[PDB]
Amino acid sequence: VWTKCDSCGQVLYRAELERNLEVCPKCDHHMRMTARNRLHSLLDEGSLVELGSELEPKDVLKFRDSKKYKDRLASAQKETGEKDALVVMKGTLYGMPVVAAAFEFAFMGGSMGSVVGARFVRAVEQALEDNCPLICFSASGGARMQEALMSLMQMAKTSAALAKMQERGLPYISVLTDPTMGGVSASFAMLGDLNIAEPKALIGFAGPRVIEQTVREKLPPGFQRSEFLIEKGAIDMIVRRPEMRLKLASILAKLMNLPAPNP
């Protein structure tokens, strides 16, 4: 029941960290949070209703790099307890209907595959039919390499869905957690009306290692971090996780023109 924060090397009490939404109480380090726990924290209590739960990985390419991709999917599903990376849940936020989606970075690096894109499109469609904001928490290593173009196209698909939402005037907030790279930051994570990002979150398109290889120099200090990006204009604002829920509610209360939430 005693965990340690790797950034500061403290001895955080486990339940103390858990009740603080997996944030170090000492150095305020934003550590891993599972999709289901994140969506339970955001949305109101007793109103969660999962969407797109009938979709499961159905590998067709029969990929095999060093382990059978079916074996990879089985192992990840057993480890994390989720069918695929993205989890969509309808619910209420301070008395306001809202559809939320959260990545599960433990599932093959939160990579975006066919099921991820299909679930995201289901979330967008649900938001459209029942007019309400969409909130997406992004934590992904990129596009699922074990599905090739069938994964790459999921970018375009999801983008199109968001375009539809933008045409209807429905707000869409895109929280950028740590990390958000590859085809998730280039398709729908940075395609939100407001690009909120958690502190010190590695956000970009190409990972630091490949940038180092190509440039063969020293990257600027604090490269691709949230604090470095907000000065580059890619991030609208940086919100701490314990204050996220309320902040989001307030924002969507003003974008939708609804009365302010009761604190």
Partner: protein, 316 residues
Amino acid sequence: NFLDFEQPIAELEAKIDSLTAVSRQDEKLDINIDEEVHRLREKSVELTRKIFADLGAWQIAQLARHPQRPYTLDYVRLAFDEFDELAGDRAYADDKAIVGGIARLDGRPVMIIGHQKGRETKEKIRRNFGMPAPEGYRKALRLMQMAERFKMPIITFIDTPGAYPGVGAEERGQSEAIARNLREMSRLGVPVVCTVIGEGGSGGALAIGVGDKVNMLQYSTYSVISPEGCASILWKSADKAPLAAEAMGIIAPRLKELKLIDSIIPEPLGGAHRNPEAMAASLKAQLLADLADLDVLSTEDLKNRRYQRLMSYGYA
């Protein structure tokens, strides 16, 4: 500079060149020289036919990266007329990795956007080896919006290693540029025809490749990551690239059966580099055919069909 497996063919071609020079150096022995030239030409044709009969996915990927191949400017020159090149994204700078403009396809006015790798070693470094910074995708978006304004169909040539993973290009929001292109290109009210001539992929190619008709040349590849990268991350080695290329399924016939592209444009025998004119003619015919059956649809029906085609991607 032919590929490794094309060493025999190259040798034969060199021989032919030599014989041609001899035929242009004397006159009393023209008959025998010409007969030998014809015989060796038939030999080269048959050798190229048999060599290319069975090419692996790695061989195809090498062909798509052949350092002698028509790029966007070459196809524009050999299949389009009256091409005016528009430069600048109006914000920061004009990326030479993406060339765009407005030209005429058999008299019809069309907008052309595409990646340009560059021919020699000077242009290759001038054009960043076909890898565009975000200020190239922003120019592509600007030109696509301009074309969509003046009821103009759009034609895209996708030939690039990917988006440039530089520090400067990363500071200026590459992800935002790509995402904005992907979002906006699905709402254009004009038919879009995309071809994957050469090498494309990694998502820096889908930024100008969300179209109504997606076409690919026979010996061209389109992958979520280069075989080198897939091998490095997954195979834990760089010399196992061909295994990654075979496993991903990046070849045109393999992608066709997955319902990811619309048609494959057959290439001249021995790759598109041997006979660029025939390749340009085939591509022009395919473009005209694709525009012919896209004009019938109304703008609303065109957009609805595009949306449905996008939503039909993937097995889920």
